[PDB]
A paper describes a structure:
Salmonella has two flagellin genes, fljB and fliC, and their expression is autonomously regulated to produce either FljB or FliC for filament formation at a frequency of 10−3–10−4 per cell per generation. This is called phase variation, and it is thought to be a mechanism to enable escape from the host immune system by changing flagellar antigenicity. The molecule consists of four domains, D0, D1, D2, and D3, arranged from the inner core to the outer surface of the filament. Domains D0 and D1 form the inner core of the filament and are made of α-helical coiled coils.
We analyzed the structure of the FljB filament by cryoEM single-particle image analysis in one of the two mutant straight forms called the R-type. We used the R-type straight form to utilize the helical symmetry for image analysis as well as to compare the structure with the R-type straight filament formed by FliC. The 3D image of the FljB filament was reconstructed at 3.6 Å resolution from about 1.1 million segment images obtained from 2319 cryoEM movie images. It showed a tubular structure formed by a helical assembly of subunit proteins with an outer diameter of 230 Å and an inner diameter of 20 Å and with a similar helical parameter to the R-type straight filament formed by FliC. The 11 protofilaments could also be recognized as in the FliC filament structure. The missing residues 193–287, corresponding to domain D3, were not built because the resolution of the 3D map was too low to trace the chain. In addition, the density level of domain D3 was much lower than other domains in FljB, indicating that domain D3 was more mobile than other domains of FljB. This indicates that the two-chain hinge connection between domains D2 and D3 was relatively flexible, making domain D3 mobile. When domains D0, D1, and D2 were superimposed between FljB and FliC, domain D3 of FljB was tilted from that of FliC by about 30°, making its position nearly 20 Å higher than that of FliC. Unlike FliC, FljB did not have these contacts, with the corresponding Cα distance between Ala 191 and Thr 350 being 18.4 Å, possibly making the two-chain domain connection less stable and domain D3 oriented differently than FliC.
Numbering used by the authors:
A (entry chain A): 51 to 151
B (entry chain A): 405 to 455
C (entry chain F), E (entry chain K), H (entry chain L): 456 to 505
D (entry chain F), F (entry chain Q), G (entry chain L): 1 to 50
Write the structure that this text describes.
């Protein structure tokens, strides 16, 4: 009987762990998108620095930068695996990876 | 009760700020991606323990 | 990723299910080859003694 | 203990053949469809989660 | 732009449809290779016992 | 982990082919016209500055 | 040691097929995209350094 | 030079990855051709003895 319980727990534990990997991948996609948006912002800042760019240029570059930052606020504010907002708030997700408590 | 507050004045350093954000983000991604290796090794452990 | 997680939950890898079907088939053939013997166990004694 | 009006040896052996038949039925059921959960395969977690 | 939007709605990219056709073909071959077994499951028991 | 009702290996490989298709589309788009910025090529600096 | 209720020979052989499936999956993943590191390919040095 | 170093870190030369995919494919075909044998190993003994 003890072995059957362990086997059931291990398999099920194994079945839940795959889910943890899936959640990590989902977070990574969002994170990758955020990083892509950030790379553009840095390049725009470098372009913006020159004495030469006019203030009518800096208005458009700021419009792009605020749209990119609204987008990395949105894609982290509302993204979810099974109704769980991964990036909106900070907390610990505990994985039961074993039959043991 | 939280909205980005209009900037008081032009940012003194537009880089330093974005290098810090990339470090927080890059660091977070790196931390996240080690947990996938931990879960993969735990799965290959549980397979042989079940067998 | 949602199709991956949903797939694990619903789709079942065969490699274990063909083996489970094979084990149930061998158990069925062994159980039927045993059942006949169980059936004829009593008759030999009764008729032999009678 | 050699009775023939009811053979107590054959009843249990049959029940085991019936259990093997049900296991073969579920394995064929999941092998043909391609999916582990249909209704009672997993009650709540699988179907609701799926 | 109207042909682009109309095209998405009507035209279907193959790359998923060849895979769906392949999955249905493997399910058909597995279902037929299972069906024969299901057919012969009963005969072994009846004839063997009889 | 040998499932056929949903092939988890083929979905990702396709997405990569779709990404390569979009990259080829932009390269052909800029090679035929002769111009890098059309609309979303560069959002603000290129088009506004241009 | 000739058991059929659980075939201890088939479970390990399958696990090896699953490991080969994962290796083929990563090789197809990197061959189609063109890039070795995606997420967990290299944890810290590759991605952070990249 | 930065694209060269970044490229080594992210881009992976195929010449090893096609070979790794081929080795995993041969291991998959050998593992499946072995799995069936493992499946039928027990049945011959049980049925033969029974």
């Amino acid at each position: 009987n003890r072995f059957t319980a362990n086997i059931k727990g291990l398999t099920q534990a194994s079945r839940n762990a795959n889910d943890g990997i899936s959640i990590a991948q989902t977070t990574e996609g969002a994170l990758n998108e955020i990083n892509n948006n950030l790379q553009r912002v840095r390049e725009l800042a470098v372009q913006s620095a020159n004495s030469t760019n006019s203030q009518s240029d800096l208005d458009s570059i700021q419009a792009e930068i605020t749209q990119r930052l609204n987008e990395i606020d949105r894609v982290s504010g509302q993204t979810q695996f099974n109704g769980v907002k991964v990036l909106a708030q900070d907390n610990t997700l505990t994985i039961q990876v074993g039959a043991n408590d | 009760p939280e909205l980005a507050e209009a900037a008081a004045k032009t940012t003194e350093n537009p880089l330093q700020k974005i290098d810090a954000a990339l470090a927080q983000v890059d660091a977070l991604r790196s931390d996240l991606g080690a947990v996938q290796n931990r879960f993969n090794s735990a799965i290959t452990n549980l397979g042989n323990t079940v067998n | 990723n949602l199709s991956e997680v949903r797939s694990r939950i619903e789709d079942s890898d065969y490699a274990t299910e063909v083996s489970n079907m094979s084990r149930a088939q061998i158990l069925q053939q062994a159980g039927t080859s045993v059942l006949a013997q169980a059936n004829q166990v009593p008759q030999n004694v009764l008729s032999l003694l009678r | 203990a050699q009775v023939i009006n009811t053979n107590s040896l054959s009843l249990l052996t049959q029940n085991n053949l019936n259990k093997s038949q049900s296991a073969l039925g579920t394995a064929i059921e999941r092998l043909s469809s391609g999916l582990r959960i249909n209704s009672a395969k997993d009650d709540a977690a699988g179907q609701a989660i799926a």
